[PDB]
Amino acid sequence: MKTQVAIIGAGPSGLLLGQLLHKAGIDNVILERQTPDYVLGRIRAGVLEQGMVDLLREAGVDRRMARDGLVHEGVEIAFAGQRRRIDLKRLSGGKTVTVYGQTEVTRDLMEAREASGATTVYQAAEVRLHDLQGERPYVTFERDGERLRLDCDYIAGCDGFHGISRQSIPAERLKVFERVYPFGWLGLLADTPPVSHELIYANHPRGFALCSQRSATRSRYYVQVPLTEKVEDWSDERFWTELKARLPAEVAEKLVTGPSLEKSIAPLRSFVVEPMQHGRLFLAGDAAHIVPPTGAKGLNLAASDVSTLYRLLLKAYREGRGELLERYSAICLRRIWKAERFSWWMTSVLHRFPDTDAFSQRIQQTELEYYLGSEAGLATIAENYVGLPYE
Amino acid sequence: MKTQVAIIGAGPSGLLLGQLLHKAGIDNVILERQTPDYVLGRIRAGVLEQGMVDLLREAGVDRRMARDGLVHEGVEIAFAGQRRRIDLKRLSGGKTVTVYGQTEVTRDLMEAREASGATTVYQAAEVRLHDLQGERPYVTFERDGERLRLDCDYIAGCDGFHGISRQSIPAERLKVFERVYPFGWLGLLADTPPVSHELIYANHPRGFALCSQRSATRSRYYVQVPLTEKVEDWSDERFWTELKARLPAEVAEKLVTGPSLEKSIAPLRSFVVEPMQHGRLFLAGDAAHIVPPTGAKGLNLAASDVSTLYRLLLKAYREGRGELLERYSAICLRRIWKAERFSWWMTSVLHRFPDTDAFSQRIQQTELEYYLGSEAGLATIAENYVGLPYE
Ligand SMILES: Cc1cc2nc3c(=O)[nH]c(=O)nc-3n(C[C@H](O)[C@H](O)[C@H](O)COP(=O)(O)OP(=O)(O)OC[C@H]3O[C@@H](n4cnc5c(N)ncnc54)[C@H](O)[C@@H]3O)c2cc1C
Ligand SMILES: Cc1cc2nc3c(=O)[nH]c(=O)nc-3n(C[C@H](O)[C@H](O)[C@H](O)COP(=O)(O)OP(=O)(O)OC[C@H]3O[C@@H](n4cnc5c(N)ncnc54)[C@H](O)[C@@H]3O)c2cc1C
Ligand SMILES: Nc1ccc(C(=O)O)cc1
Ligand SMILES: Nc1ccc(C(=O)O)cc1
């Protein structure tokens, strides 16, 4: 077969890039290793920046989001006896964030693609990239037991952290920066009403807790746990008792608990690779960088990479300005690093770290007291949270 | 002898407290271990907050400062190829800082005290504090070979990091928080014109450098050095070559070098003790807390402790409200911790740390890029730098 842009991975990055390209007349083929419902089983993200919201509207897939997504104007941080609200809308100059599940976003894009007629090959096994530096790169995969070859101009690696794309660039060409945190997030999805109309991030002596939601009758909760814990040790009862123990007395008593629909432990990590391209291969989303969940940047960074990649490919295809594609990494890395910094800061001020001396505990508490009590401090949290502008 | 308030230490904290008290009619006696010129030989501080400036005016010793001190409206930070100015005056809401040497401040207070006739015992050896919890505490010291006893109501320990005051409080009553940095500052004082009309803080791959001044024909420079260096290894030539190597090409070429009047290495440290009092003993300045030089808070924090102590003693003496003195530590610790946080942040973003991984280097660079490029970020640096309000 033959196409213009081959896309590896049908997660939100790939589907979003694919929809944008298709709408603009640039033919693309998506290759996914798993099945549609496997992809649709991943819970993940819940908070989206306004830029991603506008990107979905531009990809023409915002009907359901516009109807079901919730617009939040503030977030709360609870620490050592108090609860503080950050009015994002006034502190950021009128910007907000939208709560709409990643499963939903993926679902909406899958429907949109399924309808357009654009090619998508699920269960594409053994994907391999070839001739990344020639004028005609190609991808080979196995459908059942037949290995097919797909010819293209460019390849977008949107295959997540464990994808084949990043592995296909000569190790010597990339420079990796990584930080692994000594803890993970145990999340729990329940069909219960959320405890607040806005999220609650809480720093507690027992560790971090987060009160989120998916809708008015569906909540998503998290608690910081050691990397040595296995989800089978955490019953529903245990989770609720623990969550309650870490929240303000008045919040815990309003909490409506219930059986879990999903429970899992996600480990925290920071990861950036430089550069994000190689020949005719460009990496996007989790294939190029990972941020700890704390700042809600992962999917949002994937969206800005995709936005940049899409717009540079548009110029190359319709305007014949293929030289602009060399600028991909420079543009993306600027936003990536700023987002990585915010995610790291949030992670360090809200979590309980092992083997922390009295001094560093005091500095962690004061960081919160200063940023949450200063007009200039609240503003730095706010603009970063709502999302820094796309360049 | 007998007095109302006995003051241990004739550094700026003690002399300032002493002058304020004297002016208000509260008799005080200062006890200094060294000689007047020993105290006057310490170079130290150069930057003063507006609050300290107003405290000096209130102590009635601001003539020379008002004439010789320099008012700075901005500071510069140079990092990885660039130089950025922080306009403190507009970003802080009209506030500024004054450059007037600590030697000068001390000199002016010594003259003021010498003139008023208030008691000061230099070369008071073997100072010991007694009955800190009774109604009548007393201090004993040796003048020559005679041990005298001084009776008082309260004792202000303004004796610096190595004073006898802090050591006199039962170890079990105090909680210490300390952080020692793996480097020191090698400073050099020269009778040369400063390289800029405003300070330049520089982060360089070889380490930190700082371009300060004392007047238009006197400069003070610093460079970060390992704790293993001895000043005898650092000749004048070597210092200048090193300083030059760490500054922007355009700044280094304007530099007017010259022989040093003073050269010394100060090690960096963070130190706070809780509480700051015990019975009739109250600690102030370096006796209670130490901050790394980077944020220029040391002397400024000593000034706010003294301001609080003075005003609570006024109420106790003239208004008979001695119960208010129990609030000393609570009031002071609030400002202390905020200042400690700022000093720690400045120290970590401007210095080169040993055994730093690629990720943390990248985060350090991005912290600068974000705070120096954001209106909200610049403001957090500015208000903290000019000084947070006295409570
Ligand atoms: C607990 C948690 C909470 C989070 N919270 C938020 C939030 O509130 N907001 C936010 O912005 N971010 C959040 N994130 C992150 C977000 O989930 C990810 O950044 C986002 O999924 C990345 O999308 P992606 O398309 O790059 O990759 P993925 O979702 O990983 O999809 C990549 C696709 O690649 C396919 N693939 C893999 N290998 C191959 C191969 N060899 N060939 C073919 N296909 C292959 C995979 O099967 C997968 O379908 C959170 C993440 C977690 C884990
Ligand atoms: C390199 C450097 C740069 C700095 N830069 C700045 C700046 O720009 N701005 C700023 O705010 N801060 C700065 N600081 C800090 C500032 O110098 C100190 O915080 C300030 O000196 C503390 O004043 P103090 O009165 O509490 O103590 P000190 O200056 O230490 O004086 C204490 C007095 O106690 C006396 N004493 C000690 N033991 C006894 C005893 N047993 N009995 C009697 N007397 C005794 C001592 O001899 C001394 O005279 C800097 C410090 C250094 C070292
Ligand atoms: N920071 C985060 C905020 C919200 C969620 C979520 O709703 O899943 C996850 C992370
Ligand atoms: N942060 C600092 C600023 C200035 C000086 C000084 O002038 O000595 C010292 C420290």
Atom of ligand 2 nearest to the CA of B47: 8
- Resolution in Å equals 2.3
Q: Do the beta carbons of residue B347 and residue B201 sit within 8 Å?
A: no
Dihedral angle of Cα B112, B113, B116, B122, to the nearest 10 degrees: -150
Beta strand spans in chain B (E): 5-8, 28-31, 47-48, 70-72, 74-79, 82-87, 97-99, 120-121, 125-130, 138-143, 146-151, 154-157, 175-190, 200-203, 209-215, 218-225, 260-274, 277-278, 281-283, 289-290
Q: Residue type for A332, please?
A: C
Tokens of A254: 């309003």
Beta-bridge partners for B87 = B74
Q: Under 8 Å CB-to-CB from A181, ≥6 apart: which residues?
A: A267, A268, A269, A270, A292, A347, A351
Token pair 């007349």: residue: A25
**Nearest Cα to Cα of residue A209 among A372, A219, A260:** A219
Beta-bridge partners for B309 = none
Of A179, A362, A370, the CB nearest to B359: A179
Tokens of A73: 């104007």
**Nearest Cα to Cα of residue B339 among B375, B287, B304, B379:** B304
Judged by DSSP in three states, B338 sits in helix
Judged by DSSP in three states, B378 sits in helix
Task: Give the angle B141-B146-B150 at the CA atoms, nearest 5°.
Answer: 40
**Nearest Cα to Cα of residue A304 among A275, A277, A278, A333:** A333
Helix axes A328-350, A358-371, angle to 10 degrees: 110
Q: Do the beta carbons of residue B46 and residue B138 sit within 8 Å?
A: no
Q: Which of B43, B47, B385 to mutate to test the pocket of ligand 4 (most atoms within 8 A of CB)?
A: B47
Cα–Cα distance measured from residue B285 to residue B276, given in angstroms and rounded to the nearest whole number:
10
Q: Do B359 and A270 touch (CB under 8 A)?
A: yes
Q: Under 8 Å CB-to-CB from B60, ≥6 apart: which residues?
A: B19, B23, B112
Q: Do B341 and A363 touch (CB under 8 A)?
A: yes
Cα–Cα distance measured from residue A108 to residue A16, given in angstroms and rounded to the nearest whole number:
10
Q: Do the beta carbons of residue B49 and residue B147 sit within 8 Å?
A: no
* Cα distances (angstroms) measured from residue B133 to each of A294, B130, B193, B277, B282: 49, 9, 53, 11, 12
- Whether A80 contacts chain B with CB within 8 A: no
Q: Find the closest chain B residue to A270 by CA distance.
A: B359
Dihedral angle of Cα B27, B30, B31, B37, to the nearest 10 degrees: -150
Nearest CA to ligand 4 atom 3: B296
- Which listed residue (B138, B297, B328, B371) is catalytic? B297
Task: Give the angle B143-B309-B112 at the CA atoms, nearest 5°.
Answer: 55
Q: Is the CB of A11 under 6 A from ligand 1?
A: yes
Q: Return the half-sphere exposure (C-beta side, CA atoms, 13 A cut-off) of residue A42.
A: 17
Beta strands B5-8 and B154-157 are: parallel
Q: In what order do the strands lie in the sheet with A200-203?
A: A82-87, A74-79, A200-203, A209-215, A218-225, A175-190, A260-274, A289-290
Distance from CA of A333 to the nearest CA of B (A): 11
Phi-psi region of A123 (alpha: psi -120 to 50; beta: other; left: phi over 0): left
Chain Cα centroid distance, residue A272: 14
Beta-bridge partners for A149 = A140
Beta strands B175-190 and B260-274 are: antiparallel
Distance from CA of B362 to the nearest CA of A (A): 8
Residues 221-280 of B with CB under 8 A from A: 270, 272
Q: Residue type for B275, please?
A: P
Measured in angstroms, how far is the CA atom of residue A58 from the centroid of ligand 1?
A: 21
Task: Give the angle A294-A299-A301 at the CA atoms, nearest 5°.
Answer: 90
Sign of CA dihedral A147, A150, A154, A157: negative
Q: What is the 3 state secondary structure string of chain A? A: CECCEEEECCCHHHHHHHHHHHHCCCCEEEECCCCHHHHCCCCCCCEECHHHHHHHHHCCCCHHHHHHCEEECEEEEEECCEEEEEEHHHHCCCCCEEECCHHHHHHHHHHHHHHHCCCEECCCEEEEEECCCCCCCEEEEEECCEEEEEECCEEEECCCCCCHHHHCCCHHHCEEEEEEEEEEEEEEEECCCCCCCCCEEEECCCCCEEEEEEECCEEEEEEEECCCCCHHHCCHHHHHHHHHHCCCHHHHCCCCCCCEEEEEEEEEEEEEEECCEECCEEECHHHCEECCHHHCCHHHHHHHHHHHHHHHHHHHHHCCCHHHHHHHHHHHHHHHHHHHHHHHHHHHHHCCCCCCCHHHHHHHHHHHHHHCCCHHHHHHHHHHHHCCCCC
- Is residue A297 among the annotated active site residues? yes
* Cα distances (angstroms) measured from residue A1 to each of A38, A139, A156, B237: 26, 10, 17, 71
Sign of CA dihedral A357, A360, A366, A372: negative
> Of A268, A271, A274, A337, which to mutate for an interface test with B (greatest number of B Cβ within 10 Å)?
A337
Tokens of B187: 């400073």
- What is the C-alpha end-to-end distance of chain B, expressed in Å? 36
- Is residue A385 among the annotated active site residues? yes
Find out whether the peptide bond into B275 is cis, omega within 30 degrees of 0. Answer: yes
Dihedral angle of Cα B177, B390, B161, B190, to the nearest 10 degrees: 120
Token pair 């943390």: residue: B360
Ramachandran angles phi, psi of A5, nearest 5°: -125, 120
**Nearest Cα to Cα of residue A207 among A227, A223, A189:** A223
Tokens of A340: 């990585």
Residues 151-190 of B with CB under 8 A from A: 175-179
Cα–Cα distance measured from residue B16 to residue B300, given in angstroms and rounded to the nearest whole number:
12
- Which listed residue (A22, A72, A263, A351) is catalytic? A72
Q: Is the CB of A156 under 6 A from ligand 1?
A: no
Cα–Cα distance measured from residue A66 to residue A89, given in angstroms and rounded to the nearest whole number:
19
Where does ligand 3 bind, in terms of residues with CB under 6 Å? A 46-47, 212, 220, 293-294, 296
Q: Is the CB of A164 under 6 A from ligand 1?
A: yes
* Cα distances (angstroms) measured from residue A87 to each of A71, B163, B287, B328: 13, 47, 41, 34
Cα–Cα distance measured from residue B388 to residue A168, given in angstroms and rounded to the nearest whole number:
53
How large is the C-alpha radius of gyration of chain B? 21
Tokens of A303: 């969206």
Q: Do the beta carbons of residue B46 and residue B137 sit within 8 Å?
A: no
Nearest CA to ligand 4 atom 6: B46
Q: Under 8 Å CB-to-CB from A369, ≥6 apart: which residues?
A: B337, B338
Token pair 């005298």: residue: B148
Q: Residue type for B206, please?
A: R
Task: Give the angle B90-B91-B97 at the CA atoms, nearest 5°.
Answer: 80
* Cα distances (angstroms) measured from residue A308 to each of A47, A54, A111, A333, B118: 21, 14, 24, 11, 73
Q: Do A377 and B374 touch (CB under 8 A)?
A: no
Residues 342-381 of B with CB under 8 A from A: 344, 357-360, 362-363, 366-367, 369-370, 374, 376-377, 379-380
**Nearest Cα to Cα of residue A119 among A18, A12, A9:** A18
Burial class (CB in 10 A: 0-12, 13-18, 19+), A83: middle
- Is residue A263 among the annotated active site residues? no
Judged by DSSP in three states, B127 sits in strand
Ligand closest in space to the Cα of A47: 1
Experimental method: X-ray
- Is residue A317 among the annotated active site residues? no
What superfamily in CATH does domain A73-95+181-268+352-388 come from?
A: D-Amino Acid Oxidase, subunit A, domain 2 (3.30.9.10)
Residue ranges per structural domain of chain A: 1-72+96-180+269-351, 73-95+181-268+352-388
Q: B300: annotated binding-site residue?
A: yes
**Nearest Cα to Cα of residue B270 among B339, B187, B170:** B339
Phi-psi region of B94 (alpha: psi -120 to 50; beta: other; left: phi over 0): left
Measured in angstroms, how far is the CA atom of residue B211 from the centroid of ligand 4?
A: 8
Token pair 């993940």: residue: A44
Measured in angstroms, how far is the CA atom of residue B212 from the centroid of ligand 4?
A: 6
Find out whether the peptide bond into A275 is cis, omega within 30 degrees of 0. Answer: yes
Ramachandran angles phi, psi of B153, nearest 5°: -100, -50
Q: Do the beta carbons of residue A256 and residue A211 sit within 8 Å?
A: no
Q: Which of B159, B167, B283, B385 to mutate to test the pocket of ligand 2 (most atoms within 8 A of CB)?
A: B159
Q: Do B366 and A341 touch (CB under 8 A)?
A: yes
Cα–Cα distance measured from residue B154 to residue B318, given in angstroms and rounded to the nearest whole number:
15
> Of A91, A177, A270, A343, which to mutate for an interface test with B (greatest number of B Cβ within 10 Å)?
A177
Sign of CA dihedral A109, A111, A113, A119: positive
Buried b (16+ CB within 10 A) or exposed e, B129-162: beebeeeebbbebeeeeeeeebebbbbbbbbbee
Dihedral angle of Cα A335, A341, A346, A347, to the nearest 10 degrees: 120
Phi-psi region of B189 (alpha: psi -120 to 50; beta: other; left: phi over 0): beta
Q: A222: annotated binding-site residue?
A: yes
Tokens of A243: 């969550």
Cα–Cα distance measured from residue A44 to residue A299, given in angstroms and rounded to the nearest whole number:
9
* Cα distances (angstroms) measured from residue A90 to each of A75, B37, B330: 12, 56, 33
Q: Residue type for A25, please?
A: G
Tokens of A167: 């592995």
**Largest pairwise CA distance in chain B:** 64
**Stated length of chain B:** 391
- Is residue A175 among the annotated active site residues? no
**Nearest Cα to Cα of residue A310 among A53, A8, A84, A5:** A5
Distance from CA of B337 to the nearest CA of A (A): 7
Ramachandran angles phi, psi of A199, nearest 5°: -65, 150
- Whether B80 contacts chain A with CB within 8 A: no
- Which listed residue (A154, A201, A221, A328) is catalytic? A201
Q: Residue type for B358, please?
A: A
- Which listed residue (B181, B201, B310, B328) is catalytic? B201
**Nearest Cα to Cα of residue B345 among B322, B325, B317, B371:** B371
* Cα distances (angstroms) measured from residue A287 to each of A11, A78, A119, A305, B388: 11, 33, 22, 11, 44
- Whether A115 contacts chain B with CB within 8 A: no
How large is the C-alpha radius of gyration of chain A? 21
Burial class (CB in 10 A: 0-12, 13-18, 19+), A248: middle
Q: Residue type for A202, please?
A: A
Q: Under 8 Å CB-to-CB from A344, ≥6 apart: which residues?
A: A179, A270, A292, B363
Cα–Cα distance measured from residue B274 to residue B176, given in angstroms and rounded to the nearest whole number:
6
- Whether B389 contacts chain A with CB within 8 A: no
Of B177, B360, B377, the CB nearest to A362: B177
Q: Under 8 Å CB-to-CB from B330, ≥6 apart: which residues?
A: none
Element (H, E) at B90: helix B88-91
Beta-bridge partners for A148 = A141
- Which listed residue (B137, B194, B275, B293) is catalytic? B293
Is B1-72+96-180+269-351 a domain of CATH 2.60.40.10? Answer: no
Q: A214: annotated binding-site residue?
A: yes
| Beta carbon pairs, A and B, within 8 Å | 71
**Stated length of chain A:** 391
Q: B212: annotated binding-site residue?
A: yes
